């Protein structure tokens, strides 16, 4: 089970070539939050 594959496909549908850039951004914003959320 690879529970994130559906999400990855949707991120590719939405963002195309930029999908990994946007994923990295969302990760980094999370970190900035999770630091002191």
């Amino acid at each position: 089970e690879r529970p994130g594959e559906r999400r990855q496909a949707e991120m590719k549908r939405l963002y195309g070539d930029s999908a990994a850039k946007i994923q990295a951004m969302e990760a980094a914003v999370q970190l900035s939050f999770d630091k002191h959320c």
Partner: protein
């Protein structure tokens, strides 16, 4: 061979999302004011938002009744929010 319309849409989504995500990061370490239902105006210290749904995790939420040390303001509860970078 030209960039498709879909590829252009995807770049615009990514540009829009990047600008939005920067605006959320800009709220870290700031107060945020909210316009809620029934015309209620509150404000708090920003903590986080969810990145799927625009829920806000805040601290020292000031309401017309008192202060709540921690609060989750659900996206369905909010009409607008305002802050000063």
């Amino acid at each position: 061979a030209q960039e498709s319309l879909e590829s252009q849409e995807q770049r615009a989504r990514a540009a829009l999302r990047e600008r939005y995500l920067r605006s959320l990061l800009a709220m870290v370490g700031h107060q945020v004011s909210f316009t809620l239902h029934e015309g209620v105006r509150v404000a708090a210290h920003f903590g986080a938002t969810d990145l799927d749904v625009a829920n806000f995790y805040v601290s020292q939420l000031q309401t017309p009744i008192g202060v709540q040390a921690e609060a989750l303001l659900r996206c369905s509860d909010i009409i607008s929010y305002t802050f000063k970078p």
